[PDB]
Design a protein around this ligand. Structure first.
Ligand SMILES: CCCCCCCCCCCCCCCCCC(=O)OC[C@H](COP(=O)([O-])OCC(O)COP(=O)([O-])OC[C@@H](COC(=O)CCCCCCCCCCCCCCCCC)OC(=O)CCCCCCCCCCCCCCCCC)OC(=O)CCCCCCCCCCCCCCCCC
Ligand SMILES: CCCCCCCCCCCCCCCCCC(=O)OC[C@H](COP(=O)([O-])OCC(O)COP(=O)([O-])OC[C@@H](COC(=O)CCCCCCCCCCCCCCCCC)OC(=O)CCCCCCCCCCCCCCCCC)OC(=O)CCCCCCCCCCCCCCCCC
Ligand SMILES: CCCCCCCCCCCCCCCCCC(=O)OC[C@H](COP(=O)([O-])OCC(O)COP(=O)([O-])OC[C@@H](COC(=O)CCCCCCCCCCCCCCCCC)OC(=O)CCCCCCCCCCCCCCCCC)OC(=O)CCCCCCCCCCCCCCCCC
Ligand SMILES: CCCCCCCCCCCCCCCCCC(=O)OC[C@H](COP(=O)([O-])OCC(O)COP(=O)([O-])OC[C@@H](COC(=O)CCCCCCCCCCCCCCCCC)OC(=O)CCCCCCCCCCCCCCCCC)OC(=O)CCCCCCCCCCCCCCCCC
Ligand code: HEA
Ligand code: HEA
Ligand SMILES: CCCCCCCC/C=C\CCCCCCCC(=O)OC[C@H](COP(=O)(O)OCCN)OC(=O)CCCCCCCCCCCCCCC
Ligand SMILES: [Cu+2]
Ligand SMILES: [Cu+2]
Ligand SMILES: [Cu+2]
Lengths: 42, 139, 312, 552, 145, 79, 203
C-alpha cells in the first residue's frame, strides 16, 4: 500500500480511429502502435 | 511422511545389497579384483538413498500425520494458507543463458568467456534469489 | 527351416559358433513362443469392443488379481532362469583358455586397419617350430634424471612411472600381415586346429568380429591394465575358405573400412604359407604360391575417395 | 435458463499475450507445453538426421555423405533423440499433468522448473551447435567411448560443445527431478495418500530418483572427459582403467538413462488403459512395486552393455538383466489385464497405447536375447541391437508419448485432436516403423556392424537396407499428419466444454476444466481411491469399484 | 434438479463437472466449424466498432416472438448496450432487440437492414451465412457510444 | 542395385501408402454434426451466442446486480 | 489496498508451514545434495580406478602430500561446519545478527580452507605433480578441485544469503534459506572428510 495510483494527461494528436484498437494493443492511445500490414508485406 | 521415507529406505536396502555383492563378487571372480568404479558408484548411490531416506524418516518422526499422508482425510482438513510459490519471473532464463555462456567457454577453451559466464551466473543467481526480498528504493 | 528361424545368423564354422547358434535358436524359439502368446492375448482382448448391446452398465471393474499376478510373476522367473542356466553353460565355452593353443595370432588393430602377427605355432601332431619375435617391444619410460626444474622433481612418468606414449603393451612378430588401406588384410589360419587370438589396439578401442565365428571381442588399447581379457581362443575351424571379418566398435571416421578376412586353409597349405612368408614374400605372394586367391574374395578395399560425387 | 457462449472459442489470442509469458512463465502447465513443443522440434531435427543416414545407407556407395558426416549423424541423432527429445519430455509431461494428477496448484519450486526448461533448451542448442562448426558435430558415437573422445582422437570443437551441451542439459534434468520428487513428497491433495496417487505420478517419482542417481555421474564423467581433453588430465588414459572406467561411468548413467526414458511413459500408457478399458488399472499396487523394482534393479545392471569388452563380471550383470526383465513382464501383463474384459474403445490414445504394447514386446523379447552374453557376442554392436532399442524406445517414447499427447491435448488446450487424422498418423507410424526396423534384426544378425557409413555391394543385405529406408520415409511422412493435426487443432478443432473429453477418466486431472485454471483447480473432490475423477463423475460406481475390486 | 444424463456431477463448489464418451463431442452445434468461426469473428471484432455486445439466438422463440426476444436479450451479460438477433426456423421468424444504451446510435435505422440481410440469406437457405450478414450490417450501422 | 529403382521406391512407397491411408481414414464421416438444413426442423437446443466484446466493469460476478433488461428497441421479420 | 488482500507480513513466506508439514526447501536441497553425492561418486570412481591401476606406489615419487597443511585445513572445515550449525540454531530463533555473525565467521573459515587448498596446490605444482604431469596428480586435482569449486559455491551462497538477510526482515522463509545453505555446507564438509580419509590416510 506504499504506492499512489498514477494519473496522467498525455497531449494527444491520426485520431487512432482507423487502425489499431485498445482491445488488440492495450496502449494504442499512448504511442505509435500499428504499422500498415502492407508495409510488412512489401 | 512414512511411505515417503520407506520408499528411500527400501531403495537404500537394495542398493546396499547390490554394492556389497558387487564388491565381493568383483574382489573375487574378476580379472583385476574390485572394479572400483561400479563398486564406488553403487556405494554412493546407496549413500544417496540413505541420506534422502534418513532425512525423510527424521521428518516423518518429527511430523504428525498430515492430511496428505492421512487416509480418510477431507479436503477442508488441508484447506488453508499454502505457502509462497514464485509467480512470473524472468531470472531463470538469464541463469540458463549465463550458464550456457560458461559452458561454451569451457567447451571452446576460452578462459575469458568462462570468467564472463561465471560472473553472469553469479549475477543471475543473485537476481533470482533476491527477486522477492529486494526492498523498495529508498531514494 | 533352421536358417530362416535363425533370423539371419550365419551357420557357424567353429564348435563354439555352432553351440552359440544352437543357444540362439533355442532362445529365439522361447522368445517367439512368448511373443505369440502375448500378441494372442492382445488381439483377443481387442475382441472386447464396446458392444452396442452394452447398456448403461460398466465392465466388471475388477483389477487386483493376486493369484494371477503370482502365477505370471513366477513363470517369467522360471523361463529366465532356464535361459540363464543355458546361457551359463554356453558361456563356459566362450574362452576355454586351453594352455596349449595350436596357433596363436597376435591381432593388433590400429586406426582403420588390422595387423596379424602369428605369435606362435605349435601343432599337436608335431610341427611348426615357430615363435614370436619381441625384440621391438621397447618402452618409453620418461625417467630423465631431471626435468624443467633444477632438482628434486626427478620425474619418472605419469602412469605407473611411464608415459601414455608407451606402446609396450603391443606385441610384434616376425610375420606381420599388415593391412593397407588399398589391400584388405587376409589372416590365413590352418583348418581343424585350435586358434588363439591375442587382441590389442594400437590407438583406440574397436572390435574384432568374424560374423561366421558368431563371436566378437573388443580390442582395447591396454586390456591388461584395463582388466580386459583380450586374448580368446577358438577350439577349431571346420569349414575352409574365406570368411569376412569386420570392425564392430567405433574407430573414427573410417570405422566402416576396417574389413579383413580370415582365410581358413588346410594344415599343409598353412605349412607352405608360413614357410613362404619366412622366405621374403608378401601375403598375396604367399597365397598365390599356395594357389589361393591373393586378394580378399569376400570384400574389397573399396574406394579411398570420400564418396561418389567427389570430383575424383 | 440459457448461457451466452461464443459461437466458437478464441482461436489464438490477442497480439502479444504469449511471448512475455514464455520468458517469465512460472506456470508448469505452460512450461510443460514449452517442453512438448520444443522436444518435438528436436524430434523432427533429430529424426531428419536419420533420413540422411537412411538415404545414404540405401545403397552400398557413399552417394552424398562422407564417413565423418555420417558419423556425426548418428552421434547427434542418438544424442538429440535421447537427451534432447526423450529425457526432457518426461519432465515435459511431468510438468504438464503431475501437479494436476496430485491435486497440487504448482510444482515445488516453479522458478526452478522454469530454469530446468531453459537449461534444457540452451544446453541442447549448444550441443547441436557443433554442426555449424567447420569440423562438424561430435563424430564419436552417442556413447562416446573413452580414447576416441580424447583430445588425440576427435580433436574438433564440435566434440567439446557436445560434452558441455550435455552438462548444461544434464543440470536442467537434475533440477527437474528435484521439483517432481519434492512436489510429490510435499505438495499433495489433502486426501491423496502416497498409495492413492496415480501410477503416472508414481512412475515420475521413481524416475526422478533415477535421474538424481544417474545424471550427476554423467556430469562428473563429462567433466572428467572435458578435463582430459583440455588439460591432459590422464583421467581416461587407456593405461589406467580409462577405457573401462568411462564405460563403467557412462553406462552406470546410461542404463538408468534408458529407464528414466521408459518408466514415465509406462505411466502414460498405464493412465490411458483404465480410462478407455472402463475399469481400474489392473493391479495398481503391483505396478507401483514393479516400477520401484525396475528402478532399483536398473542401477545395478548397468554393465550389460559391456559384454563384448570382456572386462566385467559377466555372470553378475546377466543375472540381474534377467531379473530386471521380470518386473517389466509384470507391468506388461498388468496392462493386458486392464484391457481384459473391458469395454475397449480404440480412440487415438488407445490406438497408440496398444501400438506401444505390440512394438515394445518385440523389442523387449529381443532385449533378453541381448541379455545373454553368448548371444550378445555375435549380435552386439550390430543392427540387431539398433533394432532392439528402437522397437523399445520408439515403442516406449514415440507411441506412448503420442498417446500422452493425444490423451492430454484437450486437458492442456481445450481442443480435441482430430480422430481421423490421429488414426492416419498412427497407422503411418505403425506401418512405417515395423517396416524400417523389423528387417534390421536380420540386417545385423548377418555381419553388418552398426555405425557403418558404407558397405560393399558384394556384402549381402542390400535389399534390407532399402526396405529400411522405405520404412523410415514412411515414418518421415507420418509426422506430417500429426503436425497438421496439432496445428489445425490447437486453434480450431472440436472444442471440449467439459472435463474428461474421454469419459471414465481417473487421476484427478479430469476433475477440472479441460483448460485447467491457473493453479490447476477451482474444486478438489474428496479423494478416496486411485480413481478420484471416476468416483466423482460416476458416484454410483463408487460402491462397485470397491465390491468388484478384490475378485480380479 | 438433475444433472446431465450420465457422468456429470456437481462439485464441492457450484461448478458442474461433466464428461462425454471418448468418441463424441461437447458443443454439438449443427454448423461447420469454419463458418462458426466466421460468425464468432463477426460478433467479436466486426462489432468492436459498435461497442455494444452483439448476440445471436438461433433457438426457438415462441408465443409472442417480440416478448420472448426481450426476455432472452435479458440473458445477455450487459443488456444495457446489447443487440440480440433471434431467428427461429421452427417459425421462420426473426426478431432483433436492442438495449437502452444502444439507441440512437444508428441501431434503430439498422434494424430493418439487419433483418432484411438475415431474411434474404435464410430464404436462400443459409442460416449461419444470414446470421453473419445480419451481424455485419447491424454492426456497421451502430456507432460507438 | 538399380540406383534409380531404389530412389523411386524410397520416394514413392511412402507416398502411395500415405495416399491409401488418407483415402481410408480422411474420407470417413467426422464426429462434427452435419450442417442444419433449413427445411428440417430445429432439433438442437436453444443457442444463445454473445460477443464478449466489451469490458464488463469488474470481472467478479458479485456487484453486477440486476439493473434491468431496459429494452430499447425491436424488429421483426419472416424471411 | 485497505490493508491487504493477502494477510501476510512478508511478500515472501515459507513454501509450506514447516511446523506441521515438511519444509519444502529443505526437502529439495536434501535431494539435490543426495545428487551431488553421486557427482562426487563419479570423481571417487575415477580416483579409485587410477589408484587400482597404480603399480604399488600410488602417489608417484615426485608427489608428496603435505599432510601437515592438509590436517589444519580439514580441522578448519570441521570448525566451519560446527559454527554453521550454531548459525542455524540462531536462524531457528529470530537472531538475525547472531545468524549473521555465525555465517560470517563460517564464510571466513571456509575462505581460509580454500586459500590453504590453493597453497597446497601451488606447492604440489612446483614440486612436479600437476594435472597433465601424472595420473595421480590429475585424479587428485580433479577430485579436490571440484570439491574446492563446491566450497567456493558454498561461500558464494553464504555471502548471498547474508546480503539477503541485510535487505528484508528475518522470517521463517529466510531462516529456512539459512538452514538449506547450512545443509549444503555440511554436505561439503562431509565429502571433504571422505576425500581426506581417501587421499591422505587410505592413500
Ligand atoms: C529470442 C528469445 C530468446 C532470447 C534469449 C536471450 C534471453 C535473455 C534476455 C532476456 C532477459 C531479460 C528479460 O527477460 O526481460 C526482462 C525485461 C522486462 O522486465 P519487467 O518485469 O516486465 O519490468 C517491469 C518493471 O520494469 C519492473 O519490474 P522489475 O521489478 O522486475 O525490475 C526490472 C527488471 C528488468 O531488468 C532487465 O531488463 C535486465 C535485462 C537483462 C538482459 C540480459 C541480456 C543477456 C544477453 C541475451 C542476448 C539475446 O528487474 C531488474 O532485474 C533490474 C536490474 C537489472 C539486472 C541486470 C542483470 C544482468 C544479468 C547478467 C547475467 C549474465 C547473463 C549473460 C548470459 O525485459 C526487458 O525489458 C529487456 C528486453 C530483453 C533483453 C534483450 C537482450 C538482447
Ligand atoms: C532465432 C531466435 C529468435 C527468436 C525466434 C525466431 C522467430 C521469432 C518468433 C517469435 C517467437 C515466439 O515465441 O513468439 C511467438 C510468435 C507469436 O507471437 P505471440 O506474442 O506468441 O502472439 C500471441 C498469440 O497470438 C496468442 O497466444 P497463443 O498462446 O495462442 O499462441 C499460439 C500458439 C502457441 O501456443 C502456445 O501456447 C505455445 C507455447 C509453447 C510453444 C513454444 C515453446 C518454445 C519456447 C522457447 C523459446 C520461445 C521464447 O499456438 C499454436 O498455434 C501452436 C501450434 C503448434 C504447432 C505444431 C506443433 C507440433 O510466433 C510466431 O508468430 C513465430 C513462430 C515462433 C516460433 C517459430 C520459429 C522457430 C523456427 C521454426 C520452427 C522450429 C523447428 C525446428 C527448426
Ligand atoms: C555442478 C553444478 C552446481 C549446481 C548447484 C545448484 C543446484 C542446487 C539445486 C538444489 C538445491 C535446492 C533448490 O531447490 O535450489 C533453490 C534454487 C531454486 O529456486 P526456486 O526454484 O525458484 O525456489 C525457491 C527456492 O526453493 C528457495 O530456496 P533458496 O532460493 O533460498 O536457495 C537456497 C540456496 C539453495 O541451496 C543450494 O542450492 C546450495 C548451493 C550449493 C551449490 C554450490 C555450487 C557447487 C558447484 C561448483 C563446482 C562445479 O540458495 C542460496 O542462497 C545459495 C546459492 C549459491 C549457489 C552458488 C552457485 C555458483 C556456481 C558457480 C561457482 C563458481 C566456482 C566454479 C569455477 O536454486 C538455486 O538457487 C541454485 C541456482 C542454480 C545454479 C546452477 C549453476 C549453473
Ligand atoms: C569497475 C568499478 C566497479 C564499481 C562498483 C562499486 C562498488 C562499491 C560501491 C558501492 C558500495 C557501497 O556504497 O556500500 C555502502 C553500502 C551502504 O548502504 P546500505 O543501505 O548499508 O546498503 C547498500 C544499499 O544502499 C542498500 O542495499 P540493501 O541494504 O538492500 O542490501 C543489498 C545487498 C545486495 O547486493 C548484492 O548484490 C550482494 C550480493 C553480492 C554478490 C554475491 C557473490 C559474490 C562472490 C563472493 C565470493 C565468494 C568466494 O547489497 C549489499 O551487500 C550492500 C552493500 C553495498 C555494496 C554491495 C557490494 C557490491 O553498504 C555498506 O554498508 C557497506 C558495504 C561495503 C561493500 C563494498 C564493496 C564493493 C566493492 C568495493 C570496490 C569498488 C569496486 C572496484 C572495482
Ligand atoms: C526404453 C529404452 C529401453 C528399455 C526398456 C530396455 C530394456 C531392456 N534392455 Fe536395453 N537398451 C536400450 C534401451 C532400452 N532397453 C538402449 C538405448 C541400448 C543401447 C544400445 C547400445 O549402446 O549397446 C540398450 C542396450 C541393451 C543391451 C546391449 C546390447 C549390445 O550392446 O550388444 C542389452 C543386453 O545386452 C539390453 C537389454 C535389455 C533388457 C534385458 C531389457 C528388459 O529390461 C525389458 C525389455 C525386455 C522384455 C523381455 C520385456 C517383455 C517381458 C515380458 C513380455 C515378460 C515375459 C517375457 C519374458 C520373461 C522373456 N539393452
Ligand atoms: C529416442 C531415441 C531414438 C528415436 C526416436 C530414433 C528414431 C530413428 N532412428 Fe535411431 N538411434 C537411436 C535413438 C533413436 N532413434 C540411438 C540411441 C542410436 C544409436 C546411436 C549410436 O550408437 O551412436 C540410433 C541409431 C540409429 C541408426 C544406426 C546409425 C548407425 O549406426 O549407422 C539408424 C539407422 O538407420 C537409426 C534410424 C532411426 C530411424 C529411421 C528413426 C525414426 O523412427 C525417426 C523418425 C524420423 C523423423 C520423425 C524425421 C521426419 C521429419 C522430417 C523429415 C521433418 C524435418 C523438419 C525439421 C527438421 C524442422 N537410428
Ligand atoms: C568444465 C571445466 C573444464 C573441464 C573440467 C575441469 C575440472 C577441474 C576442476 C578443478 C581444478 C582446480 C585446480 C587446478 C590447479 C591444480 C594444478 C594444475 O592443474 O597443474 C598446473 C596445470 C598446468 O600444468 P603444465 O602446463 O603441465 O605446467 C606445469 C608447470 N610446471 O594447470 C592447469 O592446466 C589447470 C587449469 C584448469 C582450470 C579449470 C577451470 C574450471 C572452471 C570452469 C567453470 C565452470 C564451467 C561450467 C561448464 C558447464
Ligand atoms: Cu570398427
Ligand atoms: Cu579400429
Ligand atoms: Cu541396459
Amino acid at each position: 500500500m506504499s504506492s499512489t495510483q498514477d494519473r496522467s494527461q498525455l497531449d494527444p494528436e491520426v485520431e487512432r480511429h482507423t487502425g489499431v484498437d485498445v482491445e488488440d494493443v492495450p496502449s494504442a492511445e499512448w504511442g505509435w502502435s500499428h504499422m500498415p500490414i502492407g508495409v510488412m508485406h512489401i | 511422511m512414512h511411505i515417503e521415507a520407506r520408499l528411500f529406505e527400501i531403495l537404500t536396502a537394495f542398493f546396499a545389497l547390490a554394492a556389497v555383492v558387487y564388491a565381493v563378487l568383483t574382489a573375487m571372480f574378476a580379472t583385476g579384483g574390485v572394479e572400483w568404479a561400479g563398486t564406488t558408484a553403487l556405494v554412493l548411490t546407496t549413500g544417496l538413498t540413505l541420506i534422502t531416506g534418513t532425512f525423510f524418516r527424521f521428518v516423518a518422526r518429527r511430523l504428525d500425520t498430515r492430511p496428505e499422508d492421512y487416509e480418510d482425510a477431507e479436503i477442508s482438513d488441508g484447506a488453508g494458507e499454502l505457502g509462497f510459490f514464485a509467480p512470473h519471473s524472468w531470472w531463470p532464463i538469464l541463469i540458463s543463458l549465463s550458464f550456457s555462456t560458461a559452458a561454451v567457454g569451457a567447451a571452446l577453451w576460452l578462459p575469458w568467456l568462462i570468467a564472463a559466464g561465471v560472473a553472469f551466473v553469479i549475477t543471475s543467481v543473485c537476481g533470482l534469489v533476491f527477486e522477492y526480498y529486494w526492498g523498495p528504493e529508498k531514494h | 527351416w533352421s536358417d530362416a528361424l535363425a533370423l539371419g545368423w550365419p551357420t557357424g564354422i567353429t564348435p563354439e559358433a555352432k553351440l552359440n547358434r544352437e543357444l540362439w535358436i533355442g532362445s529365439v524359439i522361447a522368445s517367439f513362443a512368448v511373443g505369440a502368446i502375448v500378441w494372442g492375448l492382445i488381439f483377443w482382448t481387442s475382441a472386447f469392443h464396446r458392444k452396442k448391446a452394452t447398456d448403461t452398465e460398466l465392465p466388471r471393474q475388477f483389477g487386483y488379481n493376486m493369484p494371477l499376478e503370482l502365477t505370471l510373476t513366477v513363470i517369467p522367473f522360471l523361463i529366465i532362469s532356464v535361459l540363464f542356466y543355458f546361457t551359463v553353460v554356453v558361456q563356459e565355452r566362450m574362452m576355454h583358455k586351453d594352455p596349449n593353443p595350436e596357433v596363436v595370432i597376435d591381432v593388433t588393430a590400429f586406426q582403420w586397419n588390422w595387423k596379424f602377427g602369428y605369435q606362435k605355432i605349435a601343432f599337436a601332431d608335431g610341427s611348426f617350430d615357430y615363435d614370436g619375435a619381441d625384440p621391438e617391444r621397447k618402452e618409453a619410460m620418461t625417467s630423465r634424471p631431471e626435468g624443467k626444474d633444477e632438482h628434486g622433481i626427478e620425474k619418472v612418468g605419469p602412469i605407473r612411472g611411464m608415459t601414455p606414449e608407451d606402446r609396450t603393451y603391443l606385441n610384434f612378430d616376425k610375420i606381420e600381415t599388415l593391412g593397407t588401406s588399398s589391400e584388405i588384410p587376409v589372416l590365413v589360419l590352418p583348418a581343424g586346429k585350435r586358434i588363439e587370438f591375442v587382441l590389442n589396439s594400437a590407438d583406440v578401442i574397436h572390435g574384432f568380429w568374424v560374423p561366421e565365428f558368431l563371436f566378437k571381442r573388443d580390442v582395447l588399447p591396454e586390456p591388461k591394465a584395463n582388466n580386459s581379457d583380450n586374448v580368446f581362443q577358438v577350439s577349431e575351424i571346420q569349414q575352409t575358405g574365406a570368411f569376412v571379418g569386420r570392425c564392430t566398435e567405433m574407430c573414427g571416421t573410417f570405422h566402416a573400412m576396417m574389413n579383413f578376412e580370415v582365410r581358413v586353409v588346410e594344415p599343409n597349405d598353412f605349412k607352405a604359407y608360413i614357410d613362404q612368408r619366412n622366405a621374403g614374400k608378401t601375403n598375396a605372394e604367399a597365397l598365390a604360391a599356395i594357389n589361393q586367391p591373393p586378394l580378399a574374395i569376400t570384400t574389397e578395399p573399396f574406394e579411398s575417395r570420400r564418396g561418389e560425387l567427389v570430383p575424383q | 435458463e440459457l448461457e451466452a457462449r461464443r459461437p466458437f472459442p478464441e482461436r489464438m489470442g490477442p497480439k502479444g499475450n504469449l511471448i512475455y509469458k514464455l520468458i517469465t512463465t512460472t506456470d508448469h502447465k505452460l512450461i510443460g507445453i514449452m517442453y512438448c513443443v520444443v522436444c518435438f522440434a528436436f524430434f523432427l531435427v533429430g529424426g531428419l538426421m536419420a533420413l540422411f543416414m537412411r538415404t545414404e545407407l540405401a545403397m552400398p556407395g557413399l552417394q552424398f555423405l562422407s564417413n565423418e558426416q555420417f558419423n556425426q549423424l548418428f552421434t547427434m541423432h542418438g544424442t538429440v533423440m535421447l537427451l534432447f527429445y526423450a529425457t526432457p519430455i518426461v519432465f515435459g509431461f511431468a510438468n504438464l499433468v503431475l501437479p494436476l494428477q496430485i491435486g497440487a496448484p504448482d510444482v515445488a519450486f516453479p522458478r526452478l522448473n522454469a530454469l530446468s526448461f531453459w537449461l534444457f533448451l540452451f544446453g541442447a542448442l549448444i550441443a547441436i551447435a557443433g554442426f555449424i562448426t567447420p569440423g562438424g558435430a561430435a563424430d564419436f558415437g552417442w556413447t562416446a567411448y573413452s580414447p576416441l573422445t580424447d583430445a588425440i582422437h576427435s580433436p574438433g570443437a564440435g566434440g567439446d560443445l557436445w560434452i558441455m551441451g550435455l552438462a548444461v542439459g544434464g543440470l536442467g534434468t537434475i533440477l527437474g527431478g528435484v521439483n517432481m520428487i519434492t512436489t510429490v513428497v510435499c505438495m499433495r491433495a489433502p486426501g491423496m495418500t502416497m498409495f492413492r496417487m496415480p501410477i503416472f505420478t508414481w512412475n515420475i517419482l521413481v524416475t526422478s530418483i533415477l535421474v538424481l542417481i544417474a545424471f550427476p555421474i554423467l556430469t562428473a564423467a563429462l567433466f572428467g572427459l572435458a578435463a582430459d581433453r583440455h588439460l591432459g588430465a590422464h583421467i581416461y588414459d587407456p593405461a589406467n582403467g580409462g577405457v573401462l572406467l568411462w564405460q563403467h561411468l557412462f553406462w552406470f548413467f546410461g542404463h538408468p538413462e534408458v529407464y528414466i526414458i521408459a518408466l514415465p511413459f509406462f505411466g502414460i500408457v498405464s493412465e490411458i488403459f483404465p480410462v478407455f478399458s472402463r475399469k481400474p488399472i489392473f493391479g495398481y499396487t503391483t505396478l507401483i512395486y514393479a516400477t520401484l523394482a525396475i528402478a532399483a534393479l536398473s542401477v545395478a545392471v548397468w554393465a550389460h552393455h559391456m559384454y563384448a569388452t570382456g572386462a566385467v563380471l559377466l555372470p553378475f550383470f546377466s543375472f540381474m538383466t534377467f531379473l530386471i526383465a521380470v518386473p517389466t513382464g509384470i507391468k506388461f501383463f498388468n496392462w493386458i489385464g486392464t484391457m481384459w474384459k473391458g469395454q475397449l474403445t480404440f480412440e487415438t490414445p488407445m490406438l497408440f497405447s496398444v501400438g506401444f504394447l505390440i512394438t515394445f514386446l518385440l523389442g523387449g523379447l529381443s532385449g533378453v536375447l541381448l541379455a545373454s552374453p553368448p548371444l550378445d557376442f555375435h549380435v552386439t554392436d550390430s543392427y540387431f541391437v539398433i533394432a532392439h532399442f528402437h522397437y523399445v524406445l520408439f515403442g516406449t517414447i514415440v507411441f506412448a508419448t503420442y498417446a500422452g499427447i493425444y490423451f492430454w491435448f484437450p486437458k492442456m488446450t481445450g481442443r480435441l485432436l482430430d480422430e481421423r487424422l490421429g488414426k492416419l498418423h498412427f497407422w503411418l507410424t505403425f506401418i512405417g516403423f515395423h517396416t524400417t526396423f523389423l528387417v534390421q534384426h536380420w540386417l545385423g544378425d548377418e555381419g553388418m556392424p552398426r555405425r557403418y557409413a558404407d558397405y560393399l555391394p558384394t556384402d549381402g543385405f542390400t535389399t534390407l537396407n532399402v526396405i529400411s529406408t522405405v520404412g523410415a520415409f514412411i515414418l518421415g511422412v507420418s509426422m506430417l499428419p500429426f503436425v497438421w493435426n496439432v496445428f489445425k487443432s490447437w486453434r480450431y478443432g472440436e472444442p471440449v466444454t467439459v472435463d474428461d473429453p474421454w469419459g471414465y477418466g481417473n487421476s484427478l486431472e479430469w476433475a477440472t476444466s479441460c483448460p485447467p485454471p491457473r493453479h490447476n483447480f477451482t474444486e478438489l473432490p474428496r479423494i478416496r481411491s486411485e480413481r478420484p475423477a471416476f468416483e466423482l463423475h460416476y458416484p454410483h460406481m463408487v460402491e462397485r469399484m470397491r465390491a468388484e475390486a478384490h475378485v480380479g | 434438479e438433475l444433472d446431465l444424463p450420465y457422468g456429470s456431477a456437481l462439485t464441492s463448489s457450484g461448478r458442474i463437472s461433466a464428461v462425454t464418451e471418448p468418441g463424441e463431442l461437447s458443443v454439438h452445434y449443427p454448423f461447420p466449424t469454419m463458418d462458426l468461426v466466421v460468425l464468432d469473428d463477426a460478433l467479436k471484432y466486426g462489432s468492436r466498432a459498435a461497442k455494444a455486445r452483439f448476440a445471436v439466438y438461433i433457438g426457438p422463440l415462441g408465443a409472442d416472438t417480440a416478448a420472448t426476444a426481450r426476455e432472452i436479450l435479458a440473458n445477455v451479460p450487459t443488456p444495457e448496450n446489447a443487440v440480440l438477433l433471434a431467428v427461429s426456423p421452427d417459425q421462420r421468424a426473426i426478431e432483433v432487440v436492442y438495449g437502452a444504451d444502444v439507441k440512437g446510435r444508428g441501431i434503430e435505422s439498422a434494424a430493418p437492414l439487419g433483418v432484411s440481410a438475415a431474411a434474404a440469406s435464410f430464404k436462400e437457405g443459409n442460416l449461419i451465412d444470414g446470421l453473419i450478414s445480419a451481424v455485419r450490417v447491424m454492426s456497421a450501422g451502430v456507432s460507438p457510444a | 542395385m538399380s540406383t534409380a529403382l531404389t530412389h523411386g521406391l524410397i520416394g514413392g512407397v511412402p507416398l502411395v501408402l500415405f495416399a491409401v491411408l488418407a483415402l481410408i481414414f480422411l474420407t470417413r464421416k467426422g464426429p462434427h454434426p452435419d450442417t442444419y438444413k433449413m427445411s428440417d426442423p430445429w432439433t438442437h437446443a436453444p443457442i444463445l451466442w454473445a460477443a464478449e466484446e466489451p469490458r464488463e466493469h469488474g470481472h467478479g460476478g458479485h456487484g453486477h446486480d440486476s439493473h434491468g433488461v431496459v429494452i430499447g428497441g425491436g424488429a421483426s421479420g419472416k424471411w | 489496498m485497505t490493508s491487504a488482500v493477502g494477510t501476510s507480513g512478508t511478500a515472501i513466506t515459507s513454501r509450506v508451514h514447516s511446523l506441521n508439514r515438511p519444509n519444502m526447501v529443505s526437502v529439495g536441497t536434501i535431494v539435490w545434495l543426495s545428487s551431488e553425492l553421486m557427482f562426487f561418486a563419479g570423481l571417487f570412481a575415477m580416483y579409485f580406478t587410477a589408484r587400482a591401476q597404480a603399480g604399488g606406489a600410488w602417489p608417484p615419487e615426485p608427489t608428496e602430500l603435505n599432510l601437515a597443511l592438509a590436517v589444519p585445513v580439514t580441522l578448519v572445515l570441521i570448525a566451519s561446519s560446527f559454527t554453521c550449525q550454531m548459525g542455524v540454531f540462531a536462524a531457528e530463533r529470530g537472531d538475525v545478527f547472531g545468524l549473521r555473525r555465525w555465517y560470517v565467521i563460517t564464510f571466513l573459515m571456509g575462505l581460509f580452507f580454500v586459500l590453504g587448498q590453493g597453497y597446497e596446490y601451488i606447492h604440489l605444482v612446483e614440486h612436479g605433480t600437476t594435472i597433465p604431469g601424472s595420473a595421480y596428480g590429475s585424479v587428485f586435482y580433479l577430485a579436490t578441485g571440484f570439491h574446492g569449486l563446491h566450497v567456493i559455491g558454498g561461500l558464494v551462497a553464504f555471502v548471498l544469503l547474508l546480503a539477503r538477510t541485510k535487505m528484508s526482515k528475518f522470517t521463517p522463509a529466510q531462516a529456512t534459506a539459512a538452514i538449506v545453505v547450512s545443509y549444503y555446507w555440511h554436505f561439503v564438509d562431509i565429502v571433504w572428510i571422505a576425500l581426506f580419509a581417501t587421499i591422505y590416510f587410505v592413500r
